[PDB]
Design an enzyme around this catalytic site. Structure first.
Site: not given
Ligand SMILES: NC(=O)c1ccc[n+]([C@@H]2O[C@H](COP(=O)([O-])OP(=O)(O)OC[C@H]3O[C@@H](n4cnc5c(N)ncnc54)[C@H](OP(=O)(O)O)[C@@H]3O)[C@@H](O)[C@H]2O)c1
Ligand SMILES: CCCCCCCCCCCCCCCCCC(=O)OC[C@H](COP(=O)([O-])OCC[N+](C)(C)C)OC(=O)CCCCCCCCCCCCCCCCC
Ligand SMILES: CCCCCCCCCCCCCCCCCC(=O)OC[C@H](COP(=O)([O-])OCC[N+](C)(C)C)OC(=O)CCCCCCCCCCCCCCCCC
Ligand SMILES: CCCCCCCCCCCCCCCCCC(=O)OC[C@H](COP(=O)([O-])OCC[N+](C)(C)C)OC(=O)CCCCCCCCCCCCCCCCC
Ligand SMILES: CCCCCCCCCCCCCCCCCC(=O)OC[C@H](COP(=O)([O-])OCC[N+](C)(C)C)OC(=O)CCCCCCCCCCCCCCCCC
Ligand SMILES: CCCCCCCCCCCCCCCCCC(=O)OC[C@H](COP(=O)([O-])OCC[N+](C)(C)C)OC(=O)CCCCCCCCCCCCCCCCC
Ligand SMILES: CCCCCCCCCCCCCCCCCC(=O)OC[C@H](COP(=O)([O-])OCC[N+](C)(C)C)OC(=O)CCCCCCCCCCCCCCCCC
Ligand SMILES: CCCCCCCCCCCCCCCCCC(=O)OC[C@H](COP(=O)([O-])OCC[N+](C)(C)C)OC(=O)CCCCCCCCCCCCCCCCC
Ligand SMILES: CCCCCCCCCCCCCCCCCC(=O)OC[C@H](COP(=O)([O-])OCC[N+](C)(C)C)OC(=O)CCCCCCCCCCCCCCCCC
Ligand SMILES: NC(=O)c1ccc[n+]([C@@H]2O[C@H](COP(=O)([O-])OP(=O)(O)OC[C@H]3O[C@@H](n4cnc5c(N)ncnc54)[C@H](O)[C@@H]3O)[C@@H](O)[C@H]2O)c1
Ligand SMILES: NC(=O)c1ccc[n+]([C@@H]2O[C@H](COP(=O)([O-])OP(=O)(O)OC[C@H]3O[C@@H](n4cnc5c(N)ncnc54)[C@H](O)[C@@H]3O)[C@@H](O)[C@H]2O)c1
Ligand SMILES: CCCCCCCCCCCC
Ligand SMILES: CCCCCCCCCCCC
Lengths: 1038, 91, 90
Positions: A886, A921, A1002
């Site tokens: 995201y 999201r 998170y």
């Molecule tokens: N999608 C769904 O349907 C759903 C449903 C339930 C839960 N979730 C949650 O969604 C999460 C998604 O995880 P994910 O792997 O996509 O990401 P994430 O674990 O939420 O973290 C996002 C990463 O991107 C970096 N980041 C944020 N903004 C940035 C920017 N502008 N430029 C560069 N880097 C940036 C952050 O680190 P820095 O700030 O250090 O750069 C972080 O390392 C899941 O872990 C879960 O908890 C999603």
């Protein structure tokens, strides 16, 4: 005053090696860029690198300063390969030419050379032996003996061939078949594994053997054949090294080797026991039984040998079998040996003094096993003249005694043994008797025939909705949600039937079902426009033209066929309801193969129009009530069309959370308005106890759907706070609210007054609203998509509520279609993380596979690069996988990424995307955002389709993703995300991670893929880094 | 060189053996790795080998150099030999 | 090869005629639904056509899911359940 001498007046010297047939150099020209960036002056002898193909111009251009031979040894830090020996070209020992109270870096072997230590103790010098480096976890970077063993193991295989008579590979040529060569490897160390790898890559058959049980596992992981003897003796000694074997074990091992010495063609013996000489493993008559032309390579010729027939420095052909017994195998590949040895020296001098400029280098006596004090104490042999060579004992040694670490997938396979098949069959048989007794309970409480018919069509439509939602493409889960919010706008059908009067409503019950028709016509226009605006972003520009206006031909035949059948005096409403429900099923069934997606929007439009037309034709209103109905639906549809085309697609979840509340209010408006209009009929009715119960339950369900979605809106827009608001009680409060809601059905029955009924409906609506506020606000902004989908189920079943309430057959089919959709989406998203639904809602710790305390701590340091190394390493690769999160779309950075992929695909690469299911999201958000940026859908693959293509991948760009690329899910059973299915990006050649700083998103306090040797960090904002990469790719390829 | 006489073609056999021997004589005189590993001691790049002319010896050399670990960027003037290079995995 | 001759049949169908015959199939199905609607004498016929269409879609999805190694036990199961013409006899 800082403790140490600065790097400016502290020079180093690289002398030429004087030992016979020695070709290595201590520092490469790439290795004298560091130690100049660190701060030393570098002085190199005039011909130190000529033997290993390192010219003097590379030295004097990399930053060194070429001098002679007598003054390079009188430097503050002399760095050489071998021990300082007697110089024959001018008679003097090299320890005499050293600088007084200086420091030396070379191989020493102090236990075998006491007299050289007596020469060095007179010059008061400091000695760092490269071979006495303790093999701990923090010292893989400076391990010279492992590098020399690796080079010897490669050189022994590449030197076995060019002397062996025929192929290693073996192929079926048209001239005839040739078999591969069989290679035996004795002793799996570093040279043994290097030999097995370099022999297996050339297509041979490797059948290595070693006494230690870990080395046979590394043999069967390299693709070899692990041998075995029929005696079970523990080969290990004090640590990872071996020990001396019993005489009977040696005799049985020589029986095995004499058995398989008559079948192999090449054999490489690497056996070497610390403390004494190498074990003899082959007789002089055991080795002469081989074929005429075999090659026998002995990598233990210095410390004895593994043969009683080995001249320890030459080749000879002993009765038709060549004996390669070289004592200097890394000296034959002196360029690679010089580069690796220079890298080890650079990492040692970086690790022993990490200050910017002190070079303090403290030697202690008390140290933990694995800290830097262990390395500095074991490595220093002579400190300021005195010999301190036998190192003291460490602290409590962690010692790695559970070598076989309990991996995460081992523990579920061990948990599966508690599930004995009697209990499997018993818990299978208990579910079905529960379901059949529930069916009997529905049969007993049935008031009439229409209830039984509605239960049958409910169950059949629920099974249809089960099978049609698993069939959709995972790339289209967000058009699935938008079209179910469009089809759930058939709560206007329930609003029209309770709607009466004239131009304006007369009673309050007729006025509630005009606000309901109004706010339910918003969903229809909104969902169908946002689905139409999303499905035409998936149309690739090379696709054939699509003439979708031809689907006005069924609609005009369907709806226009109703009106002509209504003018002629018929009643087709119960079949028009079937046709509308089948069109709503085919709207989801068409959203399954990406070519019929635009069909599966037009069919939903035809179903909604047919249902509305059949409801209006069944009511047959006066022309002043039809004006009220058309005005309400037209104003609601105008608001839906004007809020469905002014938004951005990245603001889609909020709108989806705005669509459920308009359903959740509407159900509450249609149940209450039917308690009022059906009240003087309950005395003369037998179904009076039916239509009250459902009117209670729907008033609950919509009450949870409304307010919860208003929290889910507010925590996505940024109005509310992203932290989970926890109350003191939080379980007694919610349990009391639920007990009050299910115990208020008892005063609602047994008391037939109107005053006591409308207060129970208002009470259950208020308690359900408070329950939705309390349950949703404790979730947190990360687990908020689950709230979008679970409530997407409730607005399904709320429809089924009024489907049982108005005896309407379209509403049950549509509600069973939507509730199963939301339930399956919540299941997919709660399986994509290893959590459960009660774990998400009630807020447990971690996941279902998390054990107790102390998760593992990180190991190693992280590499950091800039834009130039990143573009030079993008240019080199051929197949690239991008894993976005995201963070890519929160920074609006997918627009440079799409153009980057468009540029790199024209140059002949293979650039693809790997999407995790819970990135974003909303289910399927990142797919539609990549489609909006312009990426064709055929290079966007899911997790389960790309997770086996990571070993055959040259480069992975991880952009804005932290937890979905974390390796602690598959290794650490104590971690916060243990057992979560993740993208296996670490199994590739090189990974570039782009994020702001070394932090966390998170959870998972430190990501262990960031400290792997094949991961480079590219710190910075994603927008500026991605469009700077776009600018470099543009300006460099044009 | 026809279809039914390719089981007995001595020049093709000697060209195949000459290609494999040219590869295994390129190494043992080239003092670096062909494969290149990422260990925790330094990135080492793969060797780069160019093959002028793919007949039997050229494709034998391309196979023996590609399976060993290096990257191949061969060239030939005929239009079919470039497709044989692309099938073997070269550039 | 035979797929290469099938390619000129798969590429000579214009994008207009695919959509035209798809819309023709759906308009024929919808007017057949209207024709079953006109001929209905009572409400039980409409309810039974509804449960017939839903049970047909359930039967469509549930027998593509069976393993292709068990097609003859599927045949045997359908012959066992088709003995419910005893319901019509009783
Ligand atoms: N999608 C769904 O349907 C759903 C449903 C339930 C839960 N979730 C949650 O969604 C999460 C998604 O995880 P994910 O792997 O996509 O990401 P994430 O674990 O939420 O973290 C996002 C990463 O991107 C970096 N980041 C944020 N903004 C940035 C920017 N502008 N430029 C560069 N880097 C940036 C952050 O680190 P820095 O700030 O250090 O750069 C972080 O390392 C899941 O872990 C879960 O908890 C999603
Ligand atoms: C009973 C509910 C559970 C059914 C499971 C199987 C029952 C087998 C026994 C059948 C006889 C039951 C009986 O006598 O009940 C007496 C009770 C008491 O009624 P009763 O006083 O008329 O007793 C029946 C006996 N005669 C008629 C001779 C007097 O029956 C009822 O309560 C009838 C009203 C039903 C209200 C709702 C029941 C539960 C519905 C659950 C729905 C679950 C959906 C998922
Ligand atoms: C309460 C009474 C109604 C629901 C009864 C249980 C429904 C089925 C749940 C069990 C099941 O099949 O789980 C496995 C499945 C998952 O199956 P799976 O674990 O094999 O996943 C692979 C799925 N296939 C094979 C299709 C590719 O669980 C779910 O789908 C959970 C959501 C079920 C939602 C049901 C909605 C329809 C209700 C109609 C009334
Ligand atoms: C009562 C509710 C009825 C449905 C309410 C739908 C709300 C609006 C939906 C989105 C806007 C679509 C507008 C049409 C359009 O742009 O078409 C070109 C588009 C072309 O795609 P497009 O991406 O170029 O869309 C252009 C849209 N704008 C201008 C806003 C950018 O095609 C379709 O929308 C699908 C094919 C045509 C429509 C056929 C669908 C079936 C019939 C639906 C109408 C209901 C029955 C009518 C019966 C008439 C005879 C009695
Ligand atoms: C458009 C959405 C549905 C509109 C429903 C209008 C309801 C209404 O006022 O019905 C009155 C009437 C009910 O019809 P009826 O069958 O009661 O009487 C019609 C008049 N005679 C006696 C001559 C048969 O609806 C209509 O007349 C329908 C008009 C549209 C169909 C005709 C054009 C196509 C042929
Ligand atoms: C006109 C009717 C509405 C449009 C069709 C709806 C539909 O079921 O789409 C076909 C859907 C298309 O989806 P599908 O089932 O072919 O593909 C999705 C499922 N996978 C990918 C797993 C195979 O096909 C069926 O459901 C086939 C069964 C027959 C459908 C028609 C039933 C008519 C009943 C009439 C009773 C009188
Ligand atoms: C009047 C009409 C309304 C009344 C009827 C309502 C019927 C509701 C039918 C849906 C309920 C489904 C329950 C079973 C779910 C599947 C079982 C399962 O394994 O779940 C474990 C999983 C989590 O456990 P898990 O991930 O460990 O299990 C997965 C299994 N392995 C590990 C082998 C892969 O549950 C979920 O993912 C949640 C899915 C269900 C979401 C339901 C939303 C609400 C539905 C109820 C509404 C009630 C309204 C009143
Ligand atoms: C008596 C009344 C019966 C009413 C039946 C209504 C449902 C039938 C049409 C919808 C289901 C079939 C379908 O999806 O066909 C589209 C598809 C369109 O194919 P496609 O090229 O779009 O491919 C994608 C769709 N799938 C994968 C599901 C096929 O066309 C066919 O299946 C061709 C054969 C159709 C046979 C049925 C004709 C219509 C019914 C006539 C009834 C008598 C008058
Ligand atoms: C009153 C009488 C009403 C009769 C209504 C008859 C409707 C027939 C038209 C629907 C055909 C199936 C949908 C189109 C389709 O996908 O065809 C290709 C399909 C094959 O699908 P396919 O291979 O094209 O799609 C991919 C499917 N997977 C991935 C699973 C392999 O053809 C068939 O399945 C042949 C049998 C047709 C269906 C038989 C009846 C079952 C449904 C009855 C519903 C009404 C009762
Ligand atoms: N994480 C860690 O702690 C870690 C990681 C990598 C390596 N290491 C250490 O590095 C070592 C690497 O091995 P090396 O090559 O440096 O040692 P080495 O030079 O002694 O290799 C000789 C090999 O021959 C084997 N051998 C001994 N006697 C034998 C006999 N009679 N028959 C057959 N085989 C026999 C030994 O077990 C060993 O594998 C490991 O053993 C371990 O101690 C530790
Ligand atoms: N079964 C069969 O079909 C079969 C069997 C055996 C041989 N053959 C044919 O015989 C030939 C086998 O090749 P060979 O090695 O035996 O012959 P060769 O020794 O003549 O090969 C020399 C190679 O150099 C190439 N070459 C020539 N001039 C060049 C230039 N200026 N720049 C670059 N490359 C140049 C040629 O194209 C050829 O590939 C091929 O044409 C092959 O198709 C076919
Ligand atoms: C009064 C007895 C029935 C109570 C429940 C009403 C109908 C809800 C749906 C039934 C199937 C799950
Ligand atoms: C093919 C499905 C049935 C078609 C019926 C057409 C109209 C019949 C009318 C019979 C008298 C009411």
């Amino acid at each position: 005053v800082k403790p140490g001498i600065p790097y400016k007046q502290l020079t180093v010297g690289v002398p030429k090696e004087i030992f016979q047939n020695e070709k290595r150099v201590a520092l490469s020209p790439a290795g004298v860029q560091a130690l100049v960036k660190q701060g030393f002056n570098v002085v190199v002898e005039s011909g130190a690198g000529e033997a290993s193909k390192f010219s003097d111009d590379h030295y004097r251009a990399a930053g060194a300063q070429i001098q002679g031979a007598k003054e390079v040894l009188a430097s503050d830090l002399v760095v050489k390969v071998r021990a300082p020996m007697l110089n024959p070209t001018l008679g003097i020992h090299e320890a005499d030419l050293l600088k007084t109270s200086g420091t030396l870096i070379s191989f020493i072997y102090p236990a075998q050379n006491p007299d050289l230590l007596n020469k060095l103790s007179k010059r008061n010098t400091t000695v760092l032996a490269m071979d006495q480096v303790p093999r701990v976890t923090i010292a893989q970077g400076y391990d010279a003996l492992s590098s020399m063993a690796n080079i010897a193991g490669y050189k022994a295989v590449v030197l076995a061939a060019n002397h062996f008579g025929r192929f290693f590979t073996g192929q079926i040529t048209a001239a005839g078949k040739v078999p591969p060569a069989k290679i035996l490897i004795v002793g799996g160390g570093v040279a043994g594994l290097a030999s097995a790898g370099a022999a297996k890559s050339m297509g041979a058959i490797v059948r290595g053997f070693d006494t230690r049980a870990a080395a046979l596992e590394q043999f069967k992981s390299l693709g070899a054949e692990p041998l075995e003897v029929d005696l079970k003796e523990s080969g290990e000694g004090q640590g990872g090294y071996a020990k001396e074997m019993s005489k009977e074990f040696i005799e049985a091992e020589m029986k095995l080797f004499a058995q398989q010495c008559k079948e192999v063609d090449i054999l490489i013996s690497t056996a070497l026991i610390p403390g004494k000489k190498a074990p003899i493993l082959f007789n002089k008559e055991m080795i002469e039984s081989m074929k005429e032309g075999s090659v026998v390579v002995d990598l233990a010729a210095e410390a004895g040998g593994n043969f009683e027939t080995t001249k320890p420095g030459e080749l000879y052909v002993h009765k038709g079998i060549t004996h390669i017994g070289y004592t200097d195998l890394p000296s034959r590949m002196a360029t690679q040996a010089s580069t690796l040895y220079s890298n080890n020296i650079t990492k040692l001098l970086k690790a022993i003094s990490p200050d910017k400029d002190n070079f303090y280098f403290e030697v202690k006596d008390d140290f933990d096993f694995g800290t830097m004090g262990h390395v500095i104490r074991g490595t220093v042999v002579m400190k300021d003249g005195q010999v301190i060579f036998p190192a003291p004992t460490p602290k409590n040694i962690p010692q790695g005694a559970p070598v076989k670490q309990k991996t995460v997938a081992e523990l579920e396979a061990e948990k599966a043994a508690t599930i004995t098949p009697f209990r499997k069959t018993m818990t299978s048989a208990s579910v079905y008797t529960a379901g059949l007794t529930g069916i009997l309970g529905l049969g007993i409480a049935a008031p009439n025939l229409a209830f039984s018919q509605m239960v049958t069509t409910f169950g059949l439509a629920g099974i249809v909705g089960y099978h049609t939602v698993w069939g959709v493409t995972p790339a289209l889960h967000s058009p699935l949600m938008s079209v179910t919010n469009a089809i759930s706008g058939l709560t206007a059908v329930g609003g029209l039937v309770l709607m009466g009067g004239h131009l304006y409503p007369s009673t309050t019950s007729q006025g509630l079902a005009a606000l309901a028709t109004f706010i339910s016509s918003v969903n229809i226009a909104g969902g169908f426009l946002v689905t139409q605006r999303m499905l035409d972003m998936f149309k690739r520009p090379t696709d054939p033209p699509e003439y979708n206006y031809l689907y006005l031909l069924p609609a005009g035949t369907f709806v226009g066929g109703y009106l002509a059948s209504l003018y002629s005096g018929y009643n087709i409403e119960q079949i028009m309801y079937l046709g509308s429900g089948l069109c709503c099923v085919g709207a989801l069934a068409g959203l399954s193969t990406q070519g019929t997606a635009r069909l599966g929007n037009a069919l939903g439009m035809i179903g909604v129009a047919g249902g509305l037309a059949a409801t209006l034709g069944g009511l047959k209103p006066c022309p002043e009530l039809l004006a009220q109905m058309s005005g309400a639906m037209a104003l609601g549809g105008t608001i839906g069309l004007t809020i469905a085309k002014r938004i951005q697609i990245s603001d889609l979840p909020q709108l989806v959370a705005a669509f459920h509340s308009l359903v959740g209010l509407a159900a509450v408006l249609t149940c209450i308005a039917e308690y009022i209009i059906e009240y003087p009929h309950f005395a003369t009715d037998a179904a009076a106890n039916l239509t009250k119960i459902v009117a209670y339950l729907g008033t609950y369900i919509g009450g949870v759907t409304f307010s919860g979605s208003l929290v889910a809106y507010g925590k996505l827009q940024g109005i509310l706070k992203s932290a989970p608001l926890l109350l003191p009680g939080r379980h007694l409060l919610n349990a009391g609210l639920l007990a009050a809601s299910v115990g208020g059905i008892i005063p609602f029955m047994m008391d037939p007054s109107f005053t006591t009924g409308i207060t129970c409906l208002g009470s259950v609506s208020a308690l359900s609203a408070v329950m939705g506020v309390t349950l949703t606000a404790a979730i947190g902004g990360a687990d908020m998509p689950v709230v979008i989908t679970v409530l997407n189920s409730y607005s399904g079943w709320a429809l089924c509520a009024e489907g049982f309430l108005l005896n309407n057959n379209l509403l049950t089919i549509v509600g069973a279609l939507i509730g199963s959709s939301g339930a399956i989406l919540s299941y997919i998203m709660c399986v994509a993380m290893n959590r459960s639904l009660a774990n998400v809602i009630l807020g447990g710790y971690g996941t279902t596979s998390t054990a107790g305390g102390k998760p593992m701590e990180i190991s190693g340091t992280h590499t950091e690069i800039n834009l130039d190394n990143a573009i030079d390493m993008i240019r080199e690769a051929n197949s690239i996988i991008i894993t976005p999160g995201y963070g890519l779309c929160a920074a609006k950075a997918q627009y440079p990424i799409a153009d980057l992929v468009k540029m790199l695909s024209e140059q002949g690469k293979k650039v693809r995307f790997g999407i995790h299911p819970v990135a974003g999201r909303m289910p399927g958000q990142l797919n539609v955002l990549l489609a909006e940026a312009g990426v064709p859908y055929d290079i966007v693959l899911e997790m389960d389709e790309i997770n086996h293509d990571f070993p055959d991948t040259d480069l992975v760009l991880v952009i804005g993703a932290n937890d979905t690329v974390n390796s602690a899910a598959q290794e650490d059973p104590n971690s916060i995300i243990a057992g979560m299915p993740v993208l296996e990006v670490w199994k590739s050649k090189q990974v570039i991670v782009m994020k702001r700083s070394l932090g966390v998103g998170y959870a998972a306090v430190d990501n262990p893929i960031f400290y792997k040797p094949n991961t480079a960090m590219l710190l910075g904002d994603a927008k500026k880094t991605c469009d700077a990469l776009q600018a470099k790719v543009r300006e460099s390829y044009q």
